[PDB]
Amino acid sequence: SGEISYADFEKVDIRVGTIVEAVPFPEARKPAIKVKIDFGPEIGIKKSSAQITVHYTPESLVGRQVLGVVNFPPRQIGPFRSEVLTLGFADANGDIVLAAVERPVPNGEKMC
Amino acid sequence: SGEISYADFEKVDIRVGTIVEAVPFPEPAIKVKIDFGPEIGIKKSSAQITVHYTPESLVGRQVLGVVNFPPRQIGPFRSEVLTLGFADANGDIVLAAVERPVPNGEKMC
């Protein structure tokens, strides 16, 4: 990807939030989990989903802080209307590892 | 922020890398070198991260960085990437991280 300005980075609104609900998404083509993430009092609770069943479980995900893009338009993923892209990386086997914060931070803080 | 497209997000190139060197930057900051793997290589950065971190606690840590800004001089120091983080409840910087080890140079998506 070509070089960018700070403005073109800053306009992408990435926030940290805490997963408050997680359930399997068996309707999806690939194995996946649906979550609700609390992004703090201003942004509120937002829906997302991800192919994160290899390393994570609905039971263990609740309470984890994740990073998400919060300013996309909603995305219909089969029957599920997602509001946020939950961010991660492929590991050495291609399985998804979640982005995180090194220690707890207020929900709704912007990445910078 | 106002609404953006997937394409707008794709213009931003954020990678995971490993801090391989860290030294204090009196002027409060720390200068780091980050290994972003075989395609990108070693990149320099500096950050006001002295409240929660030291050079000793940094070296070996994986961090996230924007790798596609123009490089900039800070006196003789050539800063090449933005090391990503968040303000804590007191305004002090907490590093973005990965939940478990990932190959250096993988793209955030």
Q: Are A76 and B75 in contact (CB under 8 A)?
A: no
Chain A residue at shortest CA distance from B71: A3
Residue B18, min C-alpha distance to chain A (Å)? 14
**Per-residue CA distances from A26 to A33, A96, B11, B54 (Å):** 8, 18, 32, 45
User: CB–CB of A111 and B5 under 8 A?
Assistant: no
CATH number of the domain at A29, please. 2.40.50.140
Q: Which two tokens stand for residue A71?
A: 């300013």
Residues of A (11-70) whose Cβ lies below 8 Å from B: 11-13, 16, 55, 64, 67, 69
Reduced DSSP (H G I as helix, E B as strand, rest coil) percent helix, strand, coil of chain B, to 5: 10, 45, 50
**Per-residue CA distances from A75 to A20, A71, A78, B5 (Å):** 20, 11, 9, 11
B109 touches chain A (CB under 8 A): yes
- The tally of domains found in chain B comes to 1
Domain that holds residue B60: 1-109
Question: Could you count the other beta carbons within 10 Å of the beta carbon of residue A42?
Answer: 8
